[PDB]
Structure formats: C-alpha cells, structure tokens
Amino acid sequence: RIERIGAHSHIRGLGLDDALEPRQASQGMVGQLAARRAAGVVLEMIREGKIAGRAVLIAGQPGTGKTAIAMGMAQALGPDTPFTAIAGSEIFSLEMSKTEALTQAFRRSIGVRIKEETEIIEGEVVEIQIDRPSKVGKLTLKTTEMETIYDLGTKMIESLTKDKVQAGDVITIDKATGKISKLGRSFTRARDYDAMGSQTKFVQCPDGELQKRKEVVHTVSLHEIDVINSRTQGFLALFSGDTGEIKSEVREQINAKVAEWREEGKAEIIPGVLFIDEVHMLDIESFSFLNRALESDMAPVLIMATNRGITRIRGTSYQSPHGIPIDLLDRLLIVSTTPYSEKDTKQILRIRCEEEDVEMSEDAYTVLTRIGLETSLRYAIQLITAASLVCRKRKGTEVQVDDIKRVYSLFLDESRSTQYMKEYQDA
Amino acid sequence: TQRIASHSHVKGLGLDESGLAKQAASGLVGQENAREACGVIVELIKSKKMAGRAVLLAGPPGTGKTALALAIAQELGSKVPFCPMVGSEVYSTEIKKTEVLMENFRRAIGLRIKETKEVYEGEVTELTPCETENPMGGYGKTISHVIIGLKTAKGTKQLKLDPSIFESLQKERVEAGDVIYIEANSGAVKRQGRCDTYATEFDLEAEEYVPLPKGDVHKKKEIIQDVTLHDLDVANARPQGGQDILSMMGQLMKPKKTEITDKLRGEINKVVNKYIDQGIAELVPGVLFVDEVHMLDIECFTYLHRALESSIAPIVIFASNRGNCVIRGTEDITSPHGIPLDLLDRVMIIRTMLYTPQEMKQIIKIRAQTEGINISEEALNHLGEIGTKTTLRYSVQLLTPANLLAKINGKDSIEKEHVEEISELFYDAKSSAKILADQQ
Amino acid sequence: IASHSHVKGLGLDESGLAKQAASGLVGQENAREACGVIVELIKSKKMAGRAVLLAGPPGTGKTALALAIAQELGSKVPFCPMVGSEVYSTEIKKTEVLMENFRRAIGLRIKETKEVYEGEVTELTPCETENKTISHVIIGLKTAKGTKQLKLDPSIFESLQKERVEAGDVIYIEANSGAVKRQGRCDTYATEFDLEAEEYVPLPKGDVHKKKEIIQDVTLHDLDVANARPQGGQDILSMMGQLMKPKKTEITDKLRGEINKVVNKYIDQGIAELVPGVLFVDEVHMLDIECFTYLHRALESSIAPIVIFASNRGNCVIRGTEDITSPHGIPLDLLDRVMIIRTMLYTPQEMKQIIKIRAQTEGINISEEALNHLGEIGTKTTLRYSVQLLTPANLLAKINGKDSIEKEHVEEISELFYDAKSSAKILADQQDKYM
Amino acid sequence: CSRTFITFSDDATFEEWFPQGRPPKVPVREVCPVTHRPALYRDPVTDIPYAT
Amino acid sequence: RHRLSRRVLLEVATAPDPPPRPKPVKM
Ligand SMILES: Nc1ncnc2c1ncn2[C@@H]1O[C@H](COP(=O)(O)OP(=O)(O)O)[C@@H](O)[C@H]1O
Ligand SMILES: Nc1ncnc2c1ncn2[C@@H]1O[C@H](COP(=O)(O)OP(=O)(O)O)[C@@H](O)[C@H]1O
Ligand SMILES: Nc1ncnc2c1ncn2[C@@H]1O[C@H](COP(=O)(O)OP(=O)(O)O)[C@@H](O)[C@H]1O
C-alpha cells in the first residue's frame, strides 16, 4: 500500500488507441506523438513474441520523455511478461564480468510458465481423529454442497500433525504431495474459551465440489533457472549476491531443455523487454558482446535511452553518434523525441501536479510553464511540490504565483548556481 | 559521556512558526536564505509522499553545508532514520560501486513495526487434567482442559489450557514447582528453569533458576520494533542460526552484498506492504545525506539518477564543495560543481553565502559556549579579526589549545595574549603554503 | 522464433561453387565456396589448429557463413560460438578461458554400458556386524519377471535412508553412479489407504537385473572440469563446492597430459571416437594483445581445433598495446597463422533478394512494390536496417485491415524509425544540445 | 465453535498418569552450628552444613 | 600465586596419605 509516488509514477501506460494512434494527453502521456507511436509499434511487436533479437533506441534532448516512454511501455505491458530495467552502469560488477552481467540481464527477461494440472481437495475441517500409539486417524471435510469422511494414512496424519490443524479450519489437501495450505478459519472458535487467545476471524467455506481439478502455474525467468541450476547451493536465485554460471554445462543445457519443453507443450515462451537506460556507460566490450547476444532466439528486445551526441565511446577514443559504435547501432533503429512546446510543457506540469494532489491557480500554471521553458522541465516539475509546501505552511488552499516565485528564489535550477559560482571555491 | 564533537552545537534550523529563519537560534546563525530553503524539504520529508527528491547544498568550503545538513536530522528528530555517508565509501573491494548506493538508499527507508503478545510467568503449582465424560466409546476419560496454577510475587491463579497444550507440556518434560513461560497467541510454551526463591539449595548446578517472577501472572505489552529495509534485506540475505549447513558457513567472512532485485520485488519490500496495509507496520521514510558527492564515479553519478527515479527512494541532500571541476572518471569535461549537468538538472541547489566578520564571531562564540570555554570579550574579538583573514575553521579551532595554555598559565578564561601565542605556534593553510613556496 | 535461422547451410554445389540462391544464403559466393574447403577440412579429422579469418565490413554475412558452417557439419560435431568479450573474466585467468574453450571445442563420443537395479522392494534387512557399523544390506526386489535378493554396500543403504523409503515401494538403483531414486510406492497398494501423500507407479517390468548400452557424446572440457572440480555421492568433498567454489584453473599437467592419455586409452581400445569441432571466435578484433600472443601457442598445438575468426575493423589500434595499430585489429604475428576469407559488400539486387528471403522466413507476405521500395530505402542505408522494417511493417498492416504490406505501410514505418546514419546528422546539427 | 478433546482410550487411569507428580519443593537454609551463619557449604566428612 | 615451586614437588614425593571413612551422625 504505502509506496510513495516517484518521478515516473504518473504514467500508467502509452495513451494509444486500438490502431496504435497516440492521443494527446491520455493515460498520463502528453504530446510526443511520433515517439509514442513508435513505442506502441514496438510494444505490439512485444506482445506477439514471434521474433527475438531486435532493439530500438529512443534518443532526444535531456528531459524529453525517454525514460518516461520506457516506464509507459513497462506499465502498458502489465505483469505476466518479464520487464527488466537496468542502467548502463549496473553491469560494472566486481563478482562477475561484464558479459556475464549482460547475459544475466537478458535471461532475466525470458519467462518460462509451466502449466501444472494438480488435483487437490478443498473443504472445511469438521472433525479429526488420530490414534497415537503406527498412528492412524481420520478426517472429515465439508463444503457448502457436500461432505465426506476420509481414512487418513500414516503420512497424511504426520502432515496434518505438523500443520496441527483443528476443526473448522478451511484447508487444501494436495493429493500428490499432501501439502496442507490453510486459507483461514470458518465460523468456529473457542478451543476452550477459558484459556487465553487472540481475536477470532472467520471466512466463508469453499463452494462447489469438495474435490476439484484446478490449474496452478509456476512462472520463472530463464536467469532464475540457470541460477538455481548453476550449482548445488540449495535455495539459489536469491542468495544475496552470487552468480557464477558456466557457459556450456548449464546455459546451453537450460536452453536445450526449454526448447524441448516448448516442443511437447510444457512451457513454450513469454519474451520480455530489457530497458537499458543510459547505455552510454557500457564499455566497448559490452557492445562487442551485445552484437552477437542479440543473434539468438532467446534474446529479448531491449530499449535504450540516450542523451549523448557526438562523443567518444567509453573504454576507447572512437568518436561515434549516440556514444555507441556503428557495429551495434546497425541493428537497432532509432526514435526521435521532439522537445515539448509551450502547451505540451504546460499540460505536463498540470498532470504532474494533479498526480501529487496539489491545486495551482491558472496564473501559477503560466508562471511555472514560463520557468520550465526558460529552464528545464524537471526543475519545473520539482517546483510543483516545493511550492505546495509554503502554501500549506501559511494555511493556504491552492498554490498561487507568489508561492512559486518565492520557492523559485529559494532554490536554483542549473544556471543561477553556476552563474553565482564566481568565488573560486575549489578545483 | 558528551565527548564534544565539531557539530555538537547545531540543535536545529532555528525557524519560527511562520517559516522565517531567525538571525541566531538553535546554535545556527546567518544563512537565513539557506536555512529557510532547506527547511521546506524538511516538511517534504515529513509528508511521506514524494520519492527520489534531491537537494544540493552547493557552496564554498567551510560555509556550513554539513552544519545545516545534519541539523535537519535534529529538526526531523531521531525517530525518522538518517543515513549519512561520504562520497568515498562507495569504492569497495567486495561490492560493486553502483551497489553501495542502492544499499544506502534502502538503509534510509525505515519501517517501524508493532506487535502485541500476552505473556505468562510464575511457578507452576499443579497441573491437573479436566475430565471429559467419555467423548469416544467406553475406553476412558478425556482431557478437555488442564487446570494450571501459576505462582507469582503478586498472586497465584488457576488457568485452563487446551489439550494440545497438555501434549506440548508432556513432551516438554517439565515438572511441578518450576517456572514456565506460555504464549497463548502462538501456543508455544518455554521454560525458565525452576524457582530460585525456594526451589534451589546451595548446589552448584547453573540450571539458571529464575527468581519468582515479579508482576501479574498475565501481562501484555506491545513490542515496538524499529527495523530498516536494509537491515531486513541483509537478514534475508545473510541468514543466521545453527542448522541448514548452507547457513553453517559462519567461518567465511560472507560480506557478500549486492542484493539481487529479485529479493527486492519479492520479499521484505512486499511483506512491508502486506504489513502496512494490514495495520501492523508504519513506514518511516528517512533521509540519505551524501556529502562530498563530487567523489562519486561517473558510473555512480549515472546510477544515481536511475535510482532517484524509483518510487521507493528517500530524499537526498548533496553537499558539493568543488567549483567548476573535472568529473572523476572522465576526461576534458568541465561540468560545474564537479557534478554532471544531467544530474545538476535534477537537484535543487541551495547557495550558502559567505560569512561576514560578525557572523563568524557569533559562530566562534557559540562553539566556545559548546566546548565550555570561558572566552573573554577581547580574545573573542581578536579571534574574529584573525579569522577574517583565514577561514572560519582555523579561527574557531583556536579555542581548545588556547584554553589549555590559559589553564596552564593560571587562568580561567582565554585572554588576548593566549590566542596570540597559539596563533604563532600554529598557522593556517595560506601561511604554510607561503612558507612552502618560499622554500624549495 | 528466428533471428539467424534463414541460414541453414553454405548452399554449395557438389563442385564446391556457391549456389547463388540456396540455403537461404545469397551473395558472398567466393566466401561460401571457400568455407566449403574449410568444412571439408573439418570433416577430414586430419588437421589441428588451422585458423580462418572471416574479414569484411559490418553486416557482410561473415557470421552468417560461420553459422552456415555449423549447419553444414551438422549437430554431430561440437560447435562453440564464442565472442571475444568472454575472455575478460574477473573470476579466472584470461588465458584460462581461451584454453578451456579450445578444450571444449573437442568432442568425444564414448559408448558406455551400465547396469540397473529396479523393482518393488520387499524387505531391507541391514546385516549387522561388529567393527559396530552396519556391514551389508539384503534387499529383495520383486518385478513382473521374478523376485531376487541382492547385497549392496552400506552407502546404498544410507542413500535409501536419505530417500526415507519403506518396505513395499518402487525404487530405481544404479550401481555405476550409486544414486538411488524414489519413483514412489507400489501401485497395487493404492486401495490400502483412502488418501496418502505417496505416489503410485506400476510394478516395474523387465528383469530386476538389466543392463543397456548408452552412446553418449561429450567434450573434453567436460572431463577436464570434472577432474578439476570433482563430485560424487555421500562424500564430504562436496564442501569444496560451498566454500572453495570459484572458477578452476586446470594445470597444464591436467588440461593436457593425463586427460589426453586416458582419452587415448579409451579410444585405442574401441570405446571412444574422436570428433573435431569448430571454434567460431566472433568479434576477435577487440581481444587483448595478450590473448593474441597466446593464440600463437594455442593454435600451434596438435590438439587445437579448426578456428574461424571474424573481424570487422579495417585498421585500428590493437587493444592492450595502446600505441601500435594493425589490420583487422589483430597483430601481424597472429594474422600470418590465419587463412583470411573475404566478404563482398552486398549490391542493390543482392540486398533486395536478401530482404525477400528474410521476409518469407518469419511468415511475412510482402508485396512486390513494397519490396522494391525497401531496395531504394536500403541502398541509402545498411542491409541490416532495411531488412528489419518487415515485422513492424507486418504488424502495422495487420492494424490497417490490409492482409499484405503496401508502399504507405513501409513508408510510414520508415518514417517512425530512423537509422544510424540518418540519426547521426540529427545530432551533428544539434551538437551542443545532447549531453 | 471448535472444541478439542484428548481421550485415553487405553484406560482412564492414563488421564492422570501423564500429568502425574506434583512434588513441590520444600528446602530451607541449613544454618551452620558453629557461628549460626547462613550455610554455604557441606563438609563431605561430617555432612554438616557450614558457612566459614 | 600457586606456581608449585620445585622443592614442593620433591616433598610431595613422600608416601601418600590414607583416605577417610566418614560416617558421623550428630549436630
Ligand atoms: N510524454 C510525457 N507525458 C507527461 N510527462 C512527461 C512526458 N515526457 C516527459 N515528462 C516529464 O518529464 C520529466 C522527466 O522526463 P524524463 O523521462 O527524464 O525525460 P528524458 O528521458 O528525455 O530525460 C518527468 O517528471 C515527466 O513528468
Ligand atoms: N550556520 C552556522 N552556525 C554555527 N556554526 C557554523 C555554521 N555554519 C558553519 N559553522 C561552523 O563551521 C565549521 C565548518 O563548517 P562545515 O559545515 O564543516 O563546512 P562545509 O559544510 O562547507 O564543509 C563547523 O565546525 C561549524 O561549527
Ligand atoms: N549470404 C546472406 N544471405 C542472406 N542474408 C544475409 C547474408 N549475409 C548477411 N545477411 C544478412 O545480414 C544481416 C547481418 O549479417 P551478419 O552475419 O551480422 O554480418 P556481419 O557478421 O558482417 O555483421 C543478417 O540479418 C542477414 O539477414
């Protein structure tokens, strides 16, 4: 519940129609029609997942919505489709190489959902008998439609004693493994009613047939598979820090077994997206590897946001556009984002202030758009909450122009601090 | 023990009820434009609404960045967590650079959790079964309840428990005339040995006989935990105990952080929400003070405005000391304040002014009051004068040695000659620089 | 899913000449007819350490030809696709990756025979004796054929105990590995209890004691890493895999020497069969000078396989030296040990037919007009860019209600999406605004 | 409401056999005979509790 | 404090002492 809003929490998805036609200010996305349409096309390509190994780059001026479009795509994609967001600087790890980090990032966005049809029982416990001396017992389960009696076995009795369930509890019995998962308690209480105990809570009993065939599903990423399969350290894929996967003995075997599972129909595929923000940080070797890492059926599509222009590639002295070599840049097609106009910045500020639940006067909007057009958009967005605090401190209702103008003099955006940096502090 | 520090005098921002900074209050003086600017972010923090906000305290060296930066922790109070860190702590030998940033980001987000549990204590006097009139066929009576009498310093009361509690007691192998521990909410029963008051003689066995528990037999007191997201993260990351041989690896150092985000989107970060919405825990978003941010590498700066865009992140109070300086890790880049333009575009800069002689004099007076020095009015004036020449640091540091010279010379207050004598034994940066330039 | 699937062979005539349009490969006829000799040499199993350098501008099929070489030899011979960036490992020596890949590209098909015990266990009486450890164990397995008793070592009884098995269940035992699995209790007892956590498997058929030959195909690197990082059952040495489990560095006497000797002992007695592989080291132009210099002794080894490099740069500074440059980014000493193979830059017609071939791969119905317009859009750009405006075009056509792709579709898809060259001018124009 | 019974089908006597005992402690300090001080030891030879 | 000086060891070499037989009953 309590997860405070962020700078990108306002976008709930690309504001597109059924024909990939971007609307002006729908679903949080304001303006930027061309880039939004391109992102919608690539997303429609994502939800299809019949080709893997493509890439699309979003370039433009700083503060034009690259990461915003990325988050919008992530949100419109929804769950049930792995989406991995990583900064270019995250792969520079000390416990693994750069290529290993890139392989892990790629395989972390490839999901394998194994459909398992396991028959179980689900009913309210009415009575339980267990004769301790092997030990033998019985069980009675009730549902709204029917009841029955069970002659528990030794291992079922052991499991129920480990769970130590009692009458009235609503539980599910896995016929295969015997695992008892209790959802809660039915309308029953008072074990003794004279001993101490916590407050009682009740829930309705299950409906329909007592025993029913339901469908469980286990969705894990290819990275998690290679991980838990890397070595015999028990309960891996969390392990707090460590991945040292081997190329052939594990990775190729995981790929082959996933292909075999897809063949018979256990878990076919669910490709994902790897949004690599600030990809200019990657080293020349990272691009060298990415060249051939995209040439694989298990290579999900990646999205890169670039802010640099004609600048040397990190790790060398080769000038290239987007700070990316023309080798990797040959595959990915680029999308251009147009700088927001006056009415675009104004509506962006309006939506971002309506997201923070702050009311600003009509002149407040005008002055803030003035500031965010003479200055960067991010500063005008940051001035929405700062101005919304002085107003409350003076027991105000909606942000006025005076509050914004005061909080503008209280802070400096990018230029009023460098222009005043005329004291020779340190260098 | 006090152990007077260098910033033990700042008690707060010293702002009035209207949000205007007083000329001198709560140890701080001057910097009204800055103490009012960094005061709005205090309310921003107290709102628990925004995530990833940043404010940059950019000024010359010694102007007071750290002075009014940690003073926010005083205004905010100790209840909300405050994680300070210098830019040099990111470079590590066992954890990547961009990861220490994340680890500190989650250490600043606190999560206070409350739980209520009943408790039982006292010498068990007797445990007799309560009879059930042949519930099954004619085999034998049945234990429907168990009457247990617990003795305490307050009084002795008989209580009933469930038959499962009777089985737990029987398998626990306890006897009568000893002290036990029951928790009805969970049902587990713990033992505290026998009663040291009457049960044990002068024998040697350290069975840990607990004295007759003092207080009511039944007691409940809400336990209030104060755990951060980083603490629970490391806990789920570096388990403890003496089982599950994987955990038995207590011989290795195991400093191995870099918590994978799978464990973030999964565990505690999720059970935190499941406890908050359930009404068990209250999130306490804290502050992340990162001074000397100019020391961060280009990779660190790039990751900074990717973690600052996450919905789960605390405020950040940077403190940049360098002017137009080259970014560490790159070449022929002259970004202002030693911070990349892209990141400066995301931070709200608060410019601190340069102290005038009178403000530095007030600061020296306050620091002398804190250290407990009885500086005189002539010594104070001369200190202010000789501090207008050099920086404030050297000026205000000449209070402890001057006081020592005074005490040694049979005095109880720093005189005009004491600081003059100390001013010659020790000199500031500029004097030493000139002396070095004159020599080889 | 297809990313490089259009290639399925070098598409060569019986006389080695490259068939213009075949195997989904078109163009580079000289390079393909040359790689024909390479694959013939690889199938000969006579040479070792011969290197090849597929040199050419970006997107010229060198990698396509490299994968077509693998498709030509088939899935029987080992193929190890490796990028030059995998050598810069932080957990192990740099040359170790190269040597273990050279060893991993060498296959070894070794037919093996193993015994198997299975059936429904009747009883398990551990023979007791004074040492006071358990001496032996008598286990009776009942199958559809018959019931037999057998004596096994105490380790197998301990393993059974780990399985928490009982009397009357079905088990699978292997005397070679010693691993004993628990398939579940016998099927006939399904009526015994009402509901239980046990699984029921039919009474195993066949004789309790049965053998079978398995024709396994593995690589030498597998044996190397198995002898360098041993494993087994019920041995505490597994602790090595918990506190001492970094990447290994098999010494010379182990990587070479003893492993080769045991493999030769297996071969000369009629149990193993050698199969050379192909080490395709793509993006070799960015290896370190140390890697290039070690490749000297790596290739000259009589065990090294046929290597097929693939460079992209024309003439740049060699990485690791920082001062000297050479063609292909490879030093001349290593460049003398490789048989360089050219790769012609594709022409308008070749590019158009490449686009055509790629279109029909992933189920795309492109019209002739759109196909021809793609040629015009491609002659201004790279082939790899023009060959990728097909899936977005098909998805956009599916939206416009048109089953096929027309001019307007690929014109709007060519407008929404830019390319490297067309996007570089956009930054050159706004130079001091991208940072 | 859910109750809980545990019945000793073998014999009702086992209903008390399990919760049997109740031997409360009744020790007290054994003041020494020499100085009447609170005893802290027990001489192995005399078995008499002493304190000094 | 109790380093067991040399001569003490030489003296301890003397014949051993007899064990007790405690069976008293009185205050
Ligand atoms: N299409 C859009 N709709 C609404 N707000 C936007 C849009 N694009 C950018 N913004 C605003 O700009 C701010 C920062 O944009 P950002 O994603 O950093 O752009 P860039 O990726 O080009 O730097 C965000 O706080 C967001 O509110
Ligand atoms: N507003 C203030 N009030 C009182 N003392 C101050 C104030 N600002 C700075 N000081 C004093 O100046 C000294 C050095 O300042 P500091 O904050 O460490 O410099 P900076 O933050 O610029 O590195 C501190 O020890 C503190 O006592
Ligand atoms: N002989 C060929 N036939 C058809 N398409 C080719 C051929 N050679 C290259 N291509 C096309 O060029 C694209 C990239 O080729 P690639 O193998 O990456 O060349 P390079 O290794 O020089 O970059 C592939 O998507 C493929 O469709």
Q: Which amino acid is at C184?
A: G
Q: Are C321 and C333 in contact (CB under 8 A)?
A: no
What is the 8-class DSSP label of residue C255?
I
> Which homologous superfamily is B1-107+236-354 in?
P-loop containing nucleotide triphosphate hydrolases (3.40.50.300)
Distance CA A170, CA C89 (A): 54
The answer to whether C and E touch (≥3 CB pairs < 8 Å) is no
CATH number 2.40.50.360 is the correct assignment for the domain at C105-226: yes
Read off the tokens for C352.
Answer: 């158009």
Q: Are C374 and C389 in contact (CB under 8 A)?
A: yes
Query: How do beta strands B287-291 and B82-86 pair?
Result: parallel
CATH of B355-438, one of 3.30.420.80, 1.10.8.60, 1.20.120.430, 3.40.50.720: 1.10.8.60
Three-state DSSP class for B93? coil
Read off the tokens for C381.
Answer: 């750009």
Q: Which amino acid is at C67?
A: L
Strand ranges, E, within B162-250: 178-182, 189-194, 218-220, 223-228
CA atoms within 13 A on the CB side of C386: 26
> Shortest CA distance to B295 belongs to which of B428, B149, B101, B429?
B101
> Which homologous superfamily is B108-235 in?
RuvBL1 DNA/RNA binding domain (2.40.50.360)
Selected residues 157-196 of chain C with any CB under 8 Å from a CB in chain A: 193-196
Give the sign of the dihedral formed by CA B401, CA B405, CA B411, CA B417.
negative
Kindly report the backbone phi and psi dihedral angles of residue A27, in degrees, each rounded to the nearest multiple of 5, phi listed first.
Answer: 60, 40
> Shortest CA distance to A388 belongs to which of B31, B73, B309, B41?
B41
Write out residues with Cβ below 6 Å of ligand 1.
A 7, 29-32, 60, 62-68, 305, 348, 351-352, 377-378, 381
Measured CA to CA in angstroms, residue C46 lies from C268, C288, C334, C416 at distances of: 17, 30, 22, 54
Write out residues with Cβ below 6 Å of ligand 3.
C 6, 25-28, 56, 58-64, 354, 357-358, 383-384, 387
Three-state DSSP class for A126? strand
Distance CA B341, CA B190 (A): 61
The rounded Cα B146 to chain-centroid distance in angstroms is 47
> Shortest CA distance to B113 belongs to which of B268, B263, B264, B267?
B268
* Enclosing H/E stretch for B54: strand B54-58
Distance CA A295, CA A333 (A): 16
> If you write DSSP's letter for every residue of A188-252 in order, what string do you get?
---SSSSS--PPP---PPP-S-SEEE--EEEEEEHHHHHHHTTS--SS-S-SSS-----IIIIII
Residue C327 pairs in a beta bridge with C315
> Which homologous superfamily is C1-104+227-345 in?
P-loop containing nucleotide triphosphate hydrolases (3.40.50.300)
Read off the tokens for A373.
Answer: 């057009």
Q: Are C392 and A42 in contact (CB under 8 A)?
A: yes
Strand ranges, E, within A232-321: 270-271, 273-277, 301-306, 311-312, 319-320
Largest Cα separation within chain E, whole Å, is: 43
**C-alpha R_g of chain C:** 30
Distance CA A239, CA B264 (A): 12
Three-state DSSP class for C7? coil
Contacts with A404 (C-beta within 8 Å, 6 or more apart), sequence order:
A360, A364, A367, A368, A371, A383, A387
Read off the tokens for B4.
Answer: 């007077």
First to last CA, chain D: 64
Instruction: Show residues of chain A in contact with C397, CB under 8 Å.
Output: none
Give the sign of the dihedral formed by CA C193, CA C198, CA C201, CA C206.
negative
How was this model experimentally determined? cryo-EM
* Enclosing H/E stretch for C108: strand C107-125
Three-state DSSP class for A372? helix
Distance CA C188, CA C122 (A): 13
Within a 10 A sphere around the Cβ of B132, how many other Cβ atoms?
Answer: 19
Read off the tokens for C15.
Answer: 């006389």
Ligand 2 mutation target, pool B9, B26, B63, B294, most atoms within 8 A of CB: B63
Query: How do beta strands C147-152 and C21-22 pair?
Result: unpaired
Whether D33 sits inside 8 A of E22 (CB atoms) is no
Residue C310 pairs in a beta bridge with C54, C282
Query: What domains sit in chain A, N to C, each tagged with a CATH number?
Result: 6-110+221-340 (3.40.50.300), 341-427 (1.10.8.60)
> Shortest CA distance to C123 belongs to which of C147, C107, C153, C97?
C147
Contacts with A147 (C-beta within 8 Å, 6 or more apart), sequence order:
A123, A126, A140, A141, A210
Kindly report the backbone phi and psi dihedral angles of residue C381, in degrees, each rounded to the nearest multiple of 5, phi listed first.
Answer: -125, -170
Q: Are A388 and A406 in contact (CB under 8 A)?
A: no
Query: Which class for C363: exposed (0-12), middle (13-18), buried (19 or more C-beta within 10 A)?
Result: exposed
Kindly report the backbone phi and psi dihedral angles of residue A243, in degrees, each rounded to the nearest multiple of 5, phi listed first.
Answer: -140, 120
- Chain D: residues touching B (Cβ < 8 Å): 3-16, 18-19, 21-27, 39-42, 49
CATH of C346-429, one of 3.40.50.300, 3.10.20.30, 1.10.8.60, 3.30.1330.10: 1.10.8.60
> Shortest CA distance to A62 belongs to which of A323, A324, A308?
A308
Distance CA B38, CA C165 (A): 69
Query: How do beta strands D41-42 and D49-50 pair?
Result: antiparallel
CA atoms within 13 A on the CB side of A128: 23
- Chain C: residues touching B (Cβ < 8 Å): 242-243, 435
Three-state DSSP class for C322? coil
The CA-based angle C340-C341-C343, given to 5 degrees, is 135
Domain ranges in chain C?
1-104+227-345, 105-226, 346-429
Residue C200 pairs in a beta bridge with C185
Instruction: Show residues of chain B in contact with C435, CB under 8 Å.
Output: 341-342
The CA-based angle C159-C160-C166, given to 5 degrees, is 165
Q: Are C238 and C231 in contact (CB under 8 A)?
A: yes
> Shortest CA distance to B142 belongs to which of A183, D31, D12, A288?
D12
Which residue, chain included where needed, has tokens 């985000």? B261
Cα torsion C376, C382, C388, C390 to 10°: value is 10
The rounded Cα B54 to chain-centroid distance in angstroms is 20
Strand ranges, E, within B156-221: 156-161, 178-182, 189-194, 218-220
Q: Which amino acid is at C257?
A: G
Q: Which of B95, B244, B349 sits opposite A412 (nearest CB)?
A: B349
CA atoms within 13 A on the CB side of B253: 4
Query: Which class for C34: exposed (0-12), middle (13-18), buried (19 or more C-beta within 10 A)?
Result: buried
Q: Are B100 and B211 in contact (CB under 8 A)?
A: no
Read off the tokens for B151.
Answer: 């003795």
Distance CA C360, CA B395 (A): 81
* Enclosing H/E stretch for A287: helix A284-293
* Enclosing H/E stretch for C242: helix C240-243
Residue B319 pairs in a beta bridge with B57, B291
Instruction: Show residues of chain B in contact with C241, CB under 8 Å.
Output: none
Kindly report the backbone phi and psi dihedral angles of residue A41, in degrees, each rounded to the nearest multiple of 5, phi listed first.
Answer: -60, -45
Number of residues in chain D: 52
Kindly report the backbone phi and psi dihedral angles of residue B327, in degrees, each rounded to the nearest multiple of 5, phi listed first.
Answer: -65, 135
- With b for 16 or more beta-carbon neighbours within 10 A and e for fewer, the D35-48 pattern comes to eeeebeeeeeeeeb
> Shortest CA distance to A353 belongs to which of A396, A391, A385, A395?
A385
Read off the tokens for A375.
Answer: 């200055």
Resolution (A): 3.2
> Shortest CA distance to B105 belongs to which of B260, B299, B286?
B286
Within a 10 A sphere around the Cβ of B129, how many other Cβ atoms?
Answer: 20
Work out the minimum CA distance from B189 to partner chain D, whole angstroms: 16
> Shortest CA distance to C49 belongs to which of C304, C220, C297?
C304
Distance CA B304, CA B322 (A): 19
Within a 10 A sphere around the Cβ of B199, how many other Cβ atoms?
Answer: 20
Q: Are B44 and A386 in contact (CB under 8 A)?
A: yes
Distance CA A407, CA A387 (A): 6
Q: Are A18 and A12 in contact (CB under 8 A)?
A: no
Query: How do beta strands C306-311 and C278-282 pair?
Result: parallel
**C-alpha R_g of chain B:** 31
Kindly report the backbone phi and psi dihedral angles of residue B13, in degrees, each rounded to the nearest multiple of 5, phi listed first.
Answer: -70, -20
Kindly report the backbone phi and psi dihedral angles of residue C79, in degrees, each rounded to the nearest multiple of 5, phi listed first.
Answer: -130, 130
What is the 8-class DSSP label of residue C128?
B
The rounded Cα C412 to chain-centroid distance in angstroms is 39
CA atoms within 13 A on the CB side of C140: 9
